[PDB]
Paper text:
Eukaryotic cells maintain an intracellular gradient of the small GTPase Ran that is predominantly bound to GTP in the nucleus and GDP in the cytoplasm. This gradient is generated by the asymmetric distribution of Ran effectors: the guanine exchange factor [name] (regulator of chromatin condensation 1) is sequestered in the nucleus bound to chromatin, while the GTPase-activating protein specific for Ran, RanGAP, and various accessory Ran-binding proteins (RanBPs) reside in the cytoplasm. The association between importin α and β is mediated by the N-terminal importin β-binding (IBB) domain10 of importin α, which also binds [name] cargos via a C-terminal helical core composed of 10 Armadillo repeats (the ‘Arm-core’). Two [name]-binding pockets known as ‘major’ and ‘minor’ have been identified on the concave surface of importin α, spanning Arm repeats 2–4 and 6–8, respectively.
To shed light on the structural basis for importin α3 selectivity, we crystallized the predominant isoform of human [name] (or [name]α47) in complex with importin α3 lacking the IBB-domain. Large crystals containing eight copies of the α3:[name] complex in the asymmetric unit were obtained in the triclinic space group. Clear electron density was observed for the [name] N-terminal tail, which is missing in our phasing model, and contains a bipartite [name] between residues 4 and 26. The tail occupies the entire [name]-binding groove of importin α3, spanning ~50 Å between Arms 2 and 9. It continues into a seven-bladed β-propeller (residues 30–421) that packs against the lateral surface of importin α3, making minimal contacts with Arms 1–4. The second region of contacts includes [name] residues (20-SKKVK-24) that occupy the major [name]-binding pocket at positions P1–P45, with K21 at the crucial P2 site. The critical S11, which is phosphorylated during mitosis to reduce association of [name] with importin α342, 43, occupies position P4′. Accordingly, the refined B-factor of [name] atoms is lower at the minor [name] box than at the major site (85 vs. 105 Å2), suggesting the minor [name]-binding site is the main site of interaction with importin α3. The open conformation of Arms 1–3 accommodates the β-propeller domain of [name], while making high-affinity contacts with the [name]. Importin α3 selectivity for [name] is therefore a direct consequence of a flexible solenoid that undergoes local conformation changes at the N terminus to avoid steric clashes with the [name] β-propeller.
Residue numbers in the entry:
A (entry chain K): 4 to 421
B (entry chain A): 71 to 487
């Protein structure tokens, strides 16, 4: 007598079936070329080993065309047409995700140790996150805070190479602050991870504050959604879009409302008070039936936004000309129109600066010029939205703009004529 | 932001309006989330996508369209059925010959979805001749991402054992898999091994094909690979292979598979322990020679160890291993099992709530006692020592007909004084 062979119960079905190809209006598609400017101390300009500084845009050698460019804190990440990711900058915390053992290889752009078709990229102070076509999110580098290192996914452990944030739900958008990361999924769920010391996560209320152990870090470094009472409605609150300030976060829902949370020490969240917002407070300062908000951005203590009509507003701390309203206007806690700006296509913010991009292709800069991020060639603090000019801008339009700590990166395209 | 505008904008003759309407369509993953399914399926937007998918010299249009059909077919089976009723598949196959790589890759993606839906859809797509064109893409100059999507489509082709995939299709796929199994990438290897997994789970026939492909000697060493996922997939595949006949299992064994298992039996992941003990539970159910091959590998002590201190699932699979060795093994082999202190942990399982495990343990003990004749005294006292006899005496209740009847038959037969 012999027993018959036993079959296996079905498994987790890892390759299960029909994975979705994500699409979102934030994905950059039109190819272009990369420009950099500002302090290139640790090679965040990607121009060479001997290049330490550029006060006006210069072209960066990339073997392929570039569809998106984002500038981290002390590094810079470019997304090519073919889908590969290029990184160059400071690899001390692993934000590049490639071997920089050979000194001088971090000074020039290099192909990231990753084999994927990447559709979106986001970079902050010490980290770098990529979003692939199928919706799964990769992440490498490390997080920090006002305090020492807090790790990336396993607490107190940085990552030198790309690591998947394993999630069952595909992600359509990634967005990065300095030391936090938000991921907007297809279903509208909004996951967050990273530091929450100042409340830039929103899903960890006043129950704790900087627990310096493995308990709080163990709860923070796990991606979780933000649950909200929809005031009558079942389920949860959905979301249409999301944006990351430096230490704070905004989100736009299908209801058109605008939510946000983080540190409001200099009123950079539109709140009347300086109280820290650990709950996604609904901002009454932005509630308007006529105005429909489309674009958000923010620095460490300032914030710039833009509406569907093209008018770009600003609010937050006013020192060093980071608002650019009236050549020394006092601190403002409400969104303020900048009359000097034409129809703006997209807005962006640096560490202590701010940039605007009009529909015709012109780019304006304003803020602290200590690092020559303004492109004017003058370290003098600029209070007016001065237009940036350079030979690499002649007969070219500005596709996108990003700015970090000591530099600024542009994406530009030749004009359609000739 | 409008619900139906596109149907007019996509009917224009201006390539900008059409190109833009289908792009703003391409924004459907977010666009779909707001309205439910029915209305957009009824109004008729889908045919519009196919018509424009035909027209060449406008690659952007084809790309946007195939994007949309792709994301539509990803939904419920009813949506994919709505896609295949448009007779869009032959147009995807026509796009497999396009010079633009983005169009080919998108087509391969969407065909991946359609095939992955179900076995009937799979046999439909094969009936049109997708396998040879898809496999023709494998070259040393292929981009890595596109290759990953191709392998993914292979996995979808090998799935759905209910109607097993066509014989000829597997005969066409296997050599490509034998080429992909040597590849350096981790994910490509993973997907390949899972394709093998489904091919082996199909049945004895397809297992015999896999064995005839000469891929087994290349598959077995993956059990000790560095990455955990390759290990898991390879273990499932090989295990499905040994779910077959005797000689097939013996082909797994002749490639020196047991040598890898000491690690797998001590691996930190619980799932690998469970699957490996499952494997051995299929090995002990083979002929006497294979059982002796398990004993000769010093694996019984770890099997019992997991039977004592493993999780519930692994304990279950180990119980099956012991019982299979009990009914299949020789008398001296079961003797070796006894002198390895198997009775106490094997009997401590009689207190679980699962009736199947209890039937396994009681059947195994009954077979042991029926087998050994002169030492039936000794073994009986062994069960009396570990308190297992108490457990058997308290198992005679109304939880299950088989547990009580078998239980008391064991008691009266072997435990009367």
């Amino acid at each position: 007598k012999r027993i018959a062979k036993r079959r296996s119960p079905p498994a987790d079905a890892i390759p299960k079936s029909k994975k979705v190809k994500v699409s979102h209006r934030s994905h950059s598609t039109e190819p272009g070329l990369v420009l950099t400017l500002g302090q290139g101390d640790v090679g965040q300009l990607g121009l060479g080993e001997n290049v330490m500084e550029r006060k006006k845009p210069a072209l960066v050698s990339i073997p392929e065309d570039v569809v998106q460019a984002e500038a981290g804190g002390m590094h810079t990440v470019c997304l090519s047409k073919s889908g590969q990711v290029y990184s160059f900058g400071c690899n001390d915390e692993g934000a590049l995700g490639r071997d920089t053992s050979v000194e001088g290889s971090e000074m020039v752009p290099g192909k990231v140790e990753l084999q994927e078709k990447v559709v979106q990229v986001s970079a902050g102070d010490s980290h770098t996150a990529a979003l692939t076509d199928d919706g799964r999110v990769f992440l490498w580098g490390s997080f920090r805070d006002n305090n020492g290192v807090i790790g990336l996914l396993e607490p107190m452990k940085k990552s030198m190479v790309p690591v998947q944030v394993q999630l069952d739900v595909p992600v359509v958008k990634v967005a990065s602050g300095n030391d936090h990361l938000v991921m907007l999924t297809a279903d509208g769920d909004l996951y967050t991870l990273g530091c929450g010391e100042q409340g830039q996560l929103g899903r960890v209320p006043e129950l704790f504050a900087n627990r310096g152990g493995r308990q709080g870090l163990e709860r923070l470094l796990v991606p979780k959604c933000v649950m909200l009472k929809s005031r009558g409605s079942r389920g949860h609150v959905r979301f249409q879009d999301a944006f990351c300030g430096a230490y704070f976060t905004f989100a736009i829902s299908h209801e058109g409302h605008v939510y946000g949370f983080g540190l409001s020490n200099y009123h950079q969240l539109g709140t009347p008070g300086t109280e820290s917002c650990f709950i996604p407070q609904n901002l009454t300062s932005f509630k308007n039936s006529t105005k429909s908000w489309v674009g958000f951005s923010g620095g460490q203590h300032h914030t710039v936004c833009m509406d569907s009509e093209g008018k770009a507003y600003s609010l937050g701390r006013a020192e060093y000309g980071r608002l650019g309203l009236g050549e020394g206007a006092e601190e403002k806690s409400i969104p303020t129109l900048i009359s000097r700006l034409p129809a703006v296509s997209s807005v962006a913010c640096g560490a202590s600066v701010g940039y605007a991009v009009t529909k015709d292709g012109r780019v304006f800069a304003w803020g602290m010029g200590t690092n020559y991020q303004l492109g004017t060639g003058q370290d003098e603090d600029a209070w007016s939205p001065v237009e940036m000019m350079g030979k690499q801008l002649e007969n070219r339009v500005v596709l996108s703009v990003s700015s970090g700590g000591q530099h600024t990166v542009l994406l530009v395209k030749d004009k359609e004529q000739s | 932001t409008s619900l139906e505008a596109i149907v007019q904008n996509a009917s224009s003759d201006n390539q900008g309006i059409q190109l833009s309407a289908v792009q703003a369509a391409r924004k459907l993953l977010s666009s779909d989330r707001n309205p439910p399914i029915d209305d957009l399926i009824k109004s008729g937007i889908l045919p519009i996508l196919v018509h424009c998918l035909e027209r060449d010299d406008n690659p952007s249009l084809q790309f946007e369209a195939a994007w949309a059909l792709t994301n539509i077919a990803s939904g419920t089976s009813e949506q994919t059925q709505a896609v295949v009723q448009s007779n869009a598949v032959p147009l995807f196959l026509r796009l497999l010959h396009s010079p633009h790589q983005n169009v080919c890759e998108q087509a391969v993606w969407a065909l991946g979805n359609i095939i992955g839906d179900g076995p009937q859809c799979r046999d439909y797509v094969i009936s049109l001749g997708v396998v040879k064109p898809l496999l023709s893409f494998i070259s040393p100059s292929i981009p890595i991402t596109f290759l990953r999507n191709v392998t993914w489509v292979m996995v979808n082709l090998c799935r759905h054992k209910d109607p097993p995939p066509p014989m000829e299709t597997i005969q066409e796929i296997l050599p490509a898999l034998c080429v992909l199994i040597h590849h350096t990438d981790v994910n490509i290897l993973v997907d390949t091994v899972w394709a093998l997994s489904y091919l082996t789970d199909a049945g004895n026939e397809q297992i015999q094909m896999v064995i005839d492909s000469g891929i087994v000697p290349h598959l077995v060493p993956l059990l000790s690979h560095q990455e955990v996922k390759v290990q898991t997939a390879a273990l499932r595949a090989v295990g499905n292979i040994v779910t077959g006949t005797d000689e097939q299992t013996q082909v797994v064994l002749n490639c020196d598979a047991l040598s890898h298992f000491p690690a797998l039996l001590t691996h930190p992941k619980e799932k690998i322990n469970k699957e490996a003990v499952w494997f051995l539970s299929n090995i002990t159910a083979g002929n006497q020679q294979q059982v002796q091959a398990v004993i000769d590998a010093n694996l019984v002590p770890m099997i019992i160890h997991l039977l004592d201190k493993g999780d519930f699932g692994t304990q279950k699979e180990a119980a099956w291993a012991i019982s299979n060795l009990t009914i299949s093994g020789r008398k001296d082999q079961v003797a070796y099992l006894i002198q390895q202190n198997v009775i106490p942990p094997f009997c401590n399982l009689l207190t679980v709530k699962d009736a199947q495990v209890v039937q396994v343990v009681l059947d195994g003990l009954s077979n042991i006692l029926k087998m050994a004749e002169d030492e039936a005294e000794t073994i009986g006292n062994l069960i009396e020592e570990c308190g297992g006899l108490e457990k058997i005496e308290q198992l005679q209740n109304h939880e299950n007909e088989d547990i009580y009847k078998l239980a008391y038959e064991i008691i009266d037969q072997f435990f009367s004084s």
